[PDB]
Amino acid sequence: RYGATSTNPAKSASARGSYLRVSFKNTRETAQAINGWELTKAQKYLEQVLDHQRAIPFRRFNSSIGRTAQGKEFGVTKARWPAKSVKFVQGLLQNAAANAEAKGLDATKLYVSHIQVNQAPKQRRRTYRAHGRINKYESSPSHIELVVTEKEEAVAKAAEKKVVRLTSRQRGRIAAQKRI
Amino acid sequence: KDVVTREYTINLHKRLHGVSFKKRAPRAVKEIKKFAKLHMGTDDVRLAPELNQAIWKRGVKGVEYRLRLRISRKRNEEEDAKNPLFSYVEPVLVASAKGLQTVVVE
Amino acid sequence: ANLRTQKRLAASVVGVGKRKVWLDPNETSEIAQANSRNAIRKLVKNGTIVKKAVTVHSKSRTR
Amino acid sequence: SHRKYEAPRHGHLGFLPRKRAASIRARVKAFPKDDRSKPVALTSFLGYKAGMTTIVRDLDRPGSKFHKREVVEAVTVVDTPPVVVVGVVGYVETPRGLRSLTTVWAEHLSDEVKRRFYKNWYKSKKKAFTKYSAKYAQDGAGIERELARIKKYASVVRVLVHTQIRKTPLAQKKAHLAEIQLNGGSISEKVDWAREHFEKTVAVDSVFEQNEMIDAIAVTKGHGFEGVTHRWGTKKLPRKTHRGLRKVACIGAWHPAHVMWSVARAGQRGYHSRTSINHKIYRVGKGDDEANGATSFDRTKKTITPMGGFVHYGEIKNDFIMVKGCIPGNRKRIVTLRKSLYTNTSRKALEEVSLKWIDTASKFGKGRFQTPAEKHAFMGTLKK
RNA sequence: UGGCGAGAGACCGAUAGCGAACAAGUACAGUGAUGGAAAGAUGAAAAGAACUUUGAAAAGAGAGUGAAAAAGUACGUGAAA
RNA sequence: GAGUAGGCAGGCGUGGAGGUCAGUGACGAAGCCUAGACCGUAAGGUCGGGUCGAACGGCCUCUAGUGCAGAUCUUGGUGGUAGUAGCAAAUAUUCAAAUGAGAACUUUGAAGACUGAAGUGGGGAAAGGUUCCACGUCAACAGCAGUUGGACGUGGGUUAGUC
RNA sequence: CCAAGGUGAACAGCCUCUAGUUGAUAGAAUAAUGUAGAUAAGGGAAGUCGGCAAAAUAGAUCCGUAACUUCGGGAUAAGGA
RNA sequence: UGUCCCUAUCUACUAUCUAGCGAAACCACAGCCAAGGGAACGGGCUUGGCAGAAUCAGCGGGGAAAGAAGACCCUGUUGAGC
């Protein structure tokens, strides 16, 4: 349960959303725009990209989509405003933040440590093509799950020694340069 | 920002100059909303159904060249928005809406 | 807020089209609670519903 | 097999690629040959295209059918408000061509040329040339050293000079700064002229005489994509053509099994940095003058500006140049007029032009009258 | 190689074995004759998740049941693309 | 001491079968995963770690529906193209309130329009079969949306001596 | 099957009354190329396999109407007002 | 009479950008050229030229592009209509 994390469950809260009917490719990209942020800067950013002030940079699923100036912020040329995705992850940010408060984590240092979007089973419809053919018309829903942890500095400090092995010639030259 | 009521003239002629005939009156509605925003700094505009009748009376493609209208920036209620003030536009009744400078009604 | 059975019933009761039936926009609670044809008949007497007089077709330019 | 009926190619293969001239300024790529005898003077001169008018003039061309006969010629006017000197660059000749050794500016740069260096100006603290202006704290020590450098070295000297956009009817405020080469005496004389003229204005009456040929350099009008049969103007294919007429049919053969650079293709055209040559100077008018439009054969108190102003541009209150024929670039554009790179002596040069009448009819329509006094006189006196 | 009643197997083990291990000659196609699928497994026992908190809600994070929820009625194991 | 077609020999692996190791195994069988290890020229074998939960193996022999990359193979699943092509014919919508978590699409009001009585009107035939109507409701469907519906859940409804 | 007013020869086209819909994914911007509509100075088939496509002509009243003919026609010939 | 000399301009709906919804064809691996040799016309081989992320709108040179076990021709001790 909850894909590979390197954070402390005593200082974390999570939120899960299974079989959510959103474009997988759009909701993967909103998640990768929001990943490794503070929860406050993240929540604010998702309302800005709903009212078309900043944009979600599309990095992987960025094929033949229109360019935009609101991409320059992220060092891309191509960005978009996935309303549905942004609204679903917002619902899951809020729900995570609520669990993080209910456990008792300072809501100020709370930063999204893990966010993962998997693919749900595809929902089945049939379109009708020229010369009386049938094709598939599939929705690709999403499995969104995110983690928010308290920020802690003072780490590594790591790790190991210089447990050294020498020869008679090495040790003898060390004993010489000391005598000098 | 204050609670004010002014009477503006809008040149709808130059704003609808070179539009598709069957989106002229709908564009006039949208451009008066843009006009109310520009002058009252307000992201909520509330066109009176009387102003709707005034723009639309002469069909989709017969929007009058000029329109004398009144814009009241008002204190907001009704599930408080992010903007604390909204602008309520009404049509002023003048026989010839031309040669009129912007005034204030108190 | 589903007064389509009330538009339909009003039109059929008064004996005109659904195009010539004015339900009161302020009095909506009452015309929602209107279920019977007897209820509609009572609301047309109160003047909550009217006939919304014919669009005139002058034969004056014809004459 | 061959074309079957061979025609010359559509389009010049020299003006490529047909992309958007990176700047919006004109970019003078060649200056004249730099005569070292005659006194120091500007070569080219920055200015703004205002619009086109008609002229009438007598024609001294012995042998021509129209010898001593009135001829109508089209004319385009360039607003040329005095351009402010604000710097001087020294260029050393190297085995990788000319290179900028250093540039020195005057301490006092106008808010005009300061606005150039910012894109969000009115948020800025306007701190440009604060420390450089404070290098004049003592008797310009940093300045005298860098000017001594440009005198000792630097086989070429150019002047940084900016337009006075405040004087034009344009709503920009952000004066176009340009380099313009000095062709004059010894490099020491060039450096001293570029120094002595710091914080001063240079007008057009000094640089450009009358009856002197000019090279108008500017970026052309936009037009966007502007499809196949308008940019090269290839054949329109027959009415019967499926999938479109407005095209080129055969790109190429196989072998070479690639579309070629020579083939005419679609994509944005217009807004290219073009240079036209041999535009004869007709008028170099002044701003210190009403009766700008007045010839020696008219004597009427009117300005070159038509009735209701130059359409899209405005009124011309500054010293200007009206020049024969069309020159490249839109109205409200930044033009650079450069002196002839050679001595054209084809009887179209050497030819003393004398204007008879300048059109000032409202070219915002089919204007009848030259002045409000003529309109009132012919019509009138109703109803104001 | 039918019907009924029984014993069996160096047979098959859910794409195999009968078309059918399941409400199979069922659903469904075609006017009709006829054509004709896919589809088994939570756990010993439902003990099928009380109760708290976010959300309009679905659900989430807890709490709990369980020998395990890395068994949640999308249920043994859970490969590869 | 080469080798296609081809022959022959020696082995490796799989489902079962007889015999044996008084074989291993809920203190964990088999299965699967493993930039860990060892053996074998190789087919393959063995071991450690994880997951898992009920069977399985060595050896001497018997037997075969016994080993896959190809068959425009079969069935099932999955992709890249791709958030691309596109969702552009039937002139056209707009303002307000109400409802609601949510309204371009729902209800009402108000405009502006169209069909223009060889109609986008009002009935019927064949065909369908409850789609009719009410209440409740929106996971699926209505290639946007959805509070709406010919959808979904529960009910109600078709009266003849003359049709 | 029933079938209104006006224009008009008219159940043609165009506009309205009764009655009915306002349903066909929307918002923004107006590059190329398209698709469906249009216009073009002068020339007038030179284009082209070929006048393909479009243009022109058009209702009504009066005038006039040829060769040819199976004596019925051609005929709204043509050409005008 | 824009069929043409010779093209131009305009309107609407597309395209384009956005929110939503969201296919298919095809796909050994793939995608820069020149010559060479070679199943005698290479994306890959040899020798050169060269070569810098991510890409958007167009385009119709190429991919001997896609569609379909050539229907023409021959063979077959394969058939059918006549």
mmCIF file of C-alpha atoms (C1' of nucleotides) in Angstrom, chain H residues 15-68:
data_model
loop_
_atom_site.group_PDB
_atom_site.id
_atom_site.type_symbol
_atom_site.label_atom_id
_atom_site.label_comp_id
_atom_site.label_asym_id
_atom_site.label_seq_id
_atom_site.Cartn_x
_atom_site.Cartn_y
_atom_site.Cartn_z
ATOM 1 C "C1'" A H 15 -8.189 24.871 -39.304
ATOM 2 C "C1'" U H 16 -5.403 27.507 -34.835
ATOM 3 C "C1'" C H 17 -5.533 28.184 -28.935
ATOM 4 C "C1'" U H 18 -8.475 26.673 -24.608
ATOM 5 C "C1'" A H 19 -12.088 23.487 -20.976
ATOM 6 C "C1'" G H 20 -14.329 18.888 -21.422
ATOM 7 C "C1'" C H 21 -14.673 14.078 -24.000
ATOM 8 C "C1'" G H 22 -11.442 11.355 -26.970
ATOM 9 C "C1'" A H 23 -10.724 7.125 -31.433
ATOM 10 C "C1'" A H 24 -8.412 4.553 -35.909
ATOM 11 C "C1'" A H 25 -5.021 3.172 -39.945
ATOM 12 C "C1'" C H 26 -0.106 1.519 -39.555
ATOM 13 C "C1'" C H 27 4.220 -0.288 -36.377
ATOM 14 C "C1'" A H 28 11.015 -6.155 -37.308
ATOM 15 C "C1'" C H 29 14.214 -2.286 -34.976
ATOM 16 C "C1'" A H 30 13.869 2.472 -36.724
ATOM 17 C "C1'" G H 31 14.423 7.335 -38.615
ATOM 18 C "C1'" C H 32 20.653 13.042 -41.834
ATOM 19 C "C1'" C H 33 23.049 12.823 -46.503
ATOM 20 C "C1'" A H 34 26.937 11.703 -51.026
ATOM 21 C "C1'" A H 35 29.278 8.027 -53.597
ATOM 22 C "C1'" G H 36 30.681 2.689 -53.494
ATOM 23 C "C1'" G H 37 29.617 -2.207 -53.712
ATOM 24 C "C1'" G H 38 25.532 -5.197 -53.356
ATOM 25 C "C1'" A H 39 19.033 -9.337 -55.221
ATOM 26 C "C1'" A H 40 22.106 -4.521 -60.526
ATOM 27 C "C1'" C H 41 17.670 2.475 -57.032
ATOM 28 C "C1'" G H 42 20.381 1.826 -48.712
ATOM 29 C "C1'" G H 43 17.848 4.419 -42.694
ATOM 30 C "C1'" G H 44 21.513 0.486 -41.211
ATOM 31 C "C1'" C H 45 27.101 -1.997 -44.768
ATOM 32 C "C1'" U H 46 32.390 0.570 -46.569
ATOM 33 C "C1'" U H 47 34.576 5.568 -47.279
ATOM 34 C "C1'" G H 48 33.547 10.473 -46.712
ATOM 35 C "C1'" G H 49 30.238 14.931 -45.419
ATOM 36 C "C1'" C H 50 29.004 15.681 -40.532
ATOM 37 C "C1'" A H 51 26.361 15.790 -35.798
ATOM 38 C "C1'" G H 52 23.663 19.716 -29.648
ATOM 39 C "C1'" A H 53 18.153 18.981 -25.551
ATOM 40 C "C1'" A H 54 12.545 19.790 -25.917
ATOM 41 C "C1'" U H 55 9.736 21.131 -29.889
ATOM 42 C "C1'" C H 56 4.782 24.135 -32.617
ATOM 43 C "C1'" A H 57 2.086 25.128 -37.398
ATOM 44 C "C1'" G H 58 2.387 23.795 -42.263
ATOM 45 C "C1'" C H 59 4.002 20.676 -46.332
ATOM 46 C "C1'" G H 60 3.386 16.528 -49.693
ATOM 47 C "C1'" G H 61 10.343 15.033 -52.074
ATOM 48 C "C1'" G H 62 11.118 10.177 -49.573
ATOM 49 C "C1'" G H 63 9.907 6.057 -46.166
ATOM 50 C "C1'" A H 64 10.373 1.504 -53.592
ATOM 51 C "C1'" A H 65 4.195 5.078 -47.237
ATOM 52 C "C1'" A H 66 -1.128 2.761 -46.409
ATOM 53 C "C1'" G H 67 -5.463 -0.191 -48.325
ATOM 54 C "C1'" A H 68 -5.793 -6.147 -50.753
#
